């Protein structure tokens, strides 16, 4: 699936506008979206793996990719964890995996979130990366209503060939990223 409406937003609309705000010398400098790594840190369903399956496969509906699990290291006795029973649903997508999901996102996921003024532009950590969290995950296209038995939320992750986040603030937005400013 090497063709979709948001794939060329970058190609034939965001790329040349990125050379305008900075002006580079080499085509392989223009900040490049190319690595989304979603995760679900649910220590909640730690005890039973039953809810765990329903959360991952449900996660597969939005990610559109085979999901995997992260095991824990130390021992949080205080919320009751030891070896590696703990669960975080991780699924890294590149190529056009991300381009099909981020299309459901900025055009169908974000807007349908309960009162969404805009993203939180403080989430730029310094490097050309960015992060955000959510609650209701049913703000997604495929997820229906008679399928959700709990509003377990998540928090995503985005990478770019961007050194300074001032370049990131210009790349994400141009691809249709709604911030609070």
């Amino acid at each position: 699936p090497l063709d979709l409406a948001l794939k060329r937003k970058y190609y034939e609309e965001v790329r040349p506008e990125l050379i305008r705000r900075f002006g580079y010398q080499n085509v392989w400098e223009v900040p490049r979206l190319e690595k989304v790594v979603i995760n679900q840190g649910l220590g909640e369903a730690k005890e039973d793996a039953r809810i765990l399956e329903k959360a991952a496969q449900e996660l597969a509906l939005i990610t559109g990719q085979k999901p995997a699990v992260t095991r824990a290291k130390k021992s949080i006795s205080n919320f009751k964890l030891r070896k590696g029973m703990p669960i975080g649903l991780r699924v890294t997508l590149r190529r056009d995996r991300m381009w099909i999901f981020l299309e459901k996102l900025l055009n169908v996921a974000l807007p349908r979130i309960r009162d969404f003024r805009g993203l939180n532009p403080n989430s730029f950590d310094g490097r050309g990366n960015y992060n955000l969290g959510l609650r209701e995950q049913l703000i997604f296209p495929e997820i229906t209503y008679d399928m959700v038995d709990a509003l377990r939320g998540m928090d995503i992750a985005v990478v770019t060939t961007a050194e300074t986040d001032e370049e990131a603030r210009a790349l994400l937005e141009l691809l249709g990223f709604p911030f609070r400013k």
Partner: peptide
């Protein structure tokens, strides 16, 4: 399969994921 997003506010989007029957409610165009 090329899905079909039919939200209340026109804006019928076509992307890629399971079951092209995505009745969205007030998407990005509203």
């Amino acid at each position: 399969v090329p899905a079909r997003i039919i939200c209340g506010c026109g804006n019928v989007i076509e992307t890629y994921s399971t079951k092209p029957e995505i009745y969205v409610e007030v998407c990005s165009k509203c």
